Design a protein around this ligand. Structure first.
Ligand code: HEM
Ligand code: HEM
Lengths: 182, 182
């Protein structure tokens, strides 16, 4: 993935758990010789997976838990590190934002040519609920999607309840989320 | 399962969709010949499963979402229908409630002698997170647990973020959930 993602991981853990802890994760992940991640360069997905693993072993939290936290963190990070205008343009409510999400990533992909973005489709089942379908080239990011949804809930001062109802990991076609909102 | 569970399914579907909707579901489950469920009497699990599957078909929604909504409904149902004191005694917080859940189900077991309760163990990864291990004699109730946890979220005015990280339905030992909370 693009170094932006790894910068953001680094950023979250350094603020929440300090630099000594990050140094350890950096060491344990096998990236002692990398001074900094370059935001607009594309790294192997391995680098992100080894960071999450090393972070899980250092922090003693399951990877999937850190994915939830990093999903939420990513909504604040992107607003503050040069994509706040783009975020705001994607909508004024949780449901409008999710409808616009493929569009946002298309806009991102102009400037990030090696982007493998996620594919999102919304089924609106009421004015307070929807089914969100998530398709990806990558596995195991469903917990991150859950965190992102809660961050968008906080962003739009909106109560939100998310439950994953279909699991690629369990042999369904693709990840599906049932979402309820104010 | 004990009749209380099927009473609550009936009570949920009746309250949100009307008795004709329920009467349709009742019929297609093969349970035309049951006037009412006896709460403190044990039934075959078959009954609940047919009720879920019939209710899925009649309402036009996946069985998972019905288990999720029912899981939430149960926390409200138990408070009203004779187990509010017991609910209250089991805790002042979400993480405390889950630690007391096996003891709650043992207390229930005094009065319901053929209870096959769930087993829940908490591994607290921080003051705001846990790994919840759910063990059961039955398959397929994982979605209901998400619902239950959302009900407990509302009971205690607590924001809850849940992904399931391991699946009893596959070669893994039992269902695990990663949870973050206020
Ligand atoms: C300004 C806002 C955003 C920017 C600039 C952005 C950019 C990106 C970038 C660069 C990646 C890495 C893809 C790669 O390296 O191939 C990515 C991945 C992802 N983004 Fe965003 N994103 C934004 C907002 C969102 C939001 C709000 C969500 C909410 C669900 C979202 C969901 C994802 C997901 C799920 C992935 C993982 C890709 C996959 O499944 O394969 N993004 N995004
Ligand atoms: C407060 C009062 C409660 C009562 C009286 C109660 C009682 C019961 C009863 C009677 C059953 C059916 C088991 C059988 O028929 O063999 C059951 C099952 C179950 N209860 Fe509760 N319960 C309560 C609260 C909770 C809560 C708060 C949760 C939250 C997670 C929970 C989780 C479950 C689960 C998962 C099952 C399914 C059993 C299985 O996995 O095999 N219960 N409970």
């Amino acid at each position: 993935m693009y170094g932006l993602v790894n910068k953001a991981i680094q950023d979250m853990i350094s603020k929440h758990h300090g630099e000594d802890t990050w140094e350890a994760i950096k060491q344990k992940a096998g990236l002692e010789d990398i001074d900094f991640f370059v935001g607009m360069e594309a790294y192997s997905d391995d680098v992100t997976y080894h960071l999450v693993g090393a972070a899980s072993e250092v922090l003693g939290k399951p990877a999937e838990e850190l994915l939830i936290a990093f999903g939420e963190y990513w909504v604040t990070y992107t607003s503050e590190e040069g994509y706040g205008e783009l975020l705001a343009s994607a909508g004024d409510s949780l449901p409008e934002f999710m409808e616009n999400l493929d569009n946002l990533h298309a806009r991102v992909g102009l400037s990030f040519p090696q982007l493998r973005p996620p594919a999102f489709e919304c089924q609106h089942t009421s004015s307070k609920s929807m089914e969100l379908h998530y398709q990806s080239t990558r596995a195991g990011l469903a917990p991150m999607v859950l965190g992102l949804l809660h961050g968008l809930g906080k962003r739009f001062q909106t109560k939100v309840e998310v439950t994953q109802t279909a699991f690629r990991e369990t042999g369904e076609d693709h990840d599906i989320f049932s979402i309820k909102y104010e």
